[PDB]
Design an enzyme around this catalytic site. Structure first.
Site, PDB file in Angstrom:
ATOM      1  N   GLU A 118      -0.135   3.535  -1.670  1.00 29.44           N
ATOM      2  CA  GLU A 118      -0.625   2.699  -0.593  1.00 29.44           C
ATOM      3  C   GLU A 118      -1.944   3.131   0.009  1.00 29.44           C
ATOM      4  O   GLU A 118      -2.587   2.332   0.635  1.00 29.44           O
ATOM      5  CB  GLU A 118       0.409   2.710   0.540  1.00 29.44           C
TER       6      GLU A 118
ATOM      7  N   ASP B 207      -4.048  -6.566   2.582  1.00 31.05           N
ATOM      8  CA  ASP B 207      -3.383  -6.045   1.400  1.00 31.05           C
ATOM      9  C   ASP B 207      -3.762  -6.840   0.129  1.00 31.05           C
ATOM     10  O   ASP B 207      -4.609  -7.720   0.157  1.00 31.05           O
ATOM     11  CB  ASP B 207      -1.889  -5.804   1.560  1.00 31.05           C
TER      12      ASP B 207
ATOM     13  N   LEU C  97       2.771  -3.409   6.702  1.00 29.86           N
ATOM     14  CA  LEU C  97       2.481  -4.833   6.865  1.00 29.86           C
ATOM     15  C   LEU C  97       2.581  -5.269   8.323  1.00 29.86           C
ATOM     16  O   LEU C  97       3.552  -5.010   9.040  1.00 29.86           O
ATOM     17  CB  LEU C  97       3.399  -5.712   6.016  1.00 29.86           C
TER      18      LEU C  97
END
Ligand SMILES: [Cl-]
Ligand SMILES: [Cl-]
Length: 162
Positions: free
Chosen positions: A11, A20, A32
């Site tokens: 990530e 993203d 998120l």
């Protein structure tokens, strides 16, 4: 290597709201924020998540704290899910991390949907499961990360991450 180090590699870390791979507002280590298109709806979620007026920027400690929460939520979601728990119970330590990774990225519901691959994992049919996992939007949209996770399932080692 452990789950945290694995996910930090997959990530990355960003301290300003970013989008993203799917175009969603995110921050930190793959946290998120919202699927809404509004950056303002994103700043509202962020401030609520952190507990202060952030103006779209957070510190490293705040990023790691969101990450700690997310990893915990991923694990607890697995253990609570009727379809996932049995698979998790069945796996060795390394492979357990791979399933956590998929859940962290896609959500418990999404992973639970990989019915056939889950059954192959439970049966310990590594090569077969790896082939079946690759026939997915997941694999086609984020191929390098999916390969890394798939290899972890196939081999039961951290080689893809080393
Ligand atoms: Cl949160
Ligand atoms: Cl990728």
């Amino acid at each position: 290597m452990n789950i945290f180090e694995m996910l930090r590699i997959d990530e990355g870390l960003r301290l300003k709201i970013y989008k993203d791979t799917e175009g969603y507002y995110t921050i930190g280590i793959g946290h998120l924020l919202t699927k809404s298109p509004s950056l303002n709806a994103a700043k509202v979620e962020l401030d609520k998540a952190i507990g202060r007026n952030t103006n779209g920027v957070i510190t490293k400690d705040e990023a790691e704290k969101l990450f700690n929460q997310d990893v915990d939520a991923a694990v607890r979601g697995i253990l609570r899910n009727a379809k996932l728990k049995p698979v998790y119970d069945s796996l060795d330590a390394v492979r357990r991390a791979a399933l956590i990774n998929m859940v962290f990225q896609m959500g418990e519901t999404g992973v639970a949907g990989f019915t056939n691959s889950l059954r192959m994992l439970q049966q310990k049919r590594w090569d077969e499961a790896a082939v079946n996992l690759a026939k997915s939007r997941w694999y086609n949209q984020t191929p390098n990360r999916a390969k890394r996770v798939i290899t972890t399932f196939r081999t039961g080692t951290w080689d893809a991450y080393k």
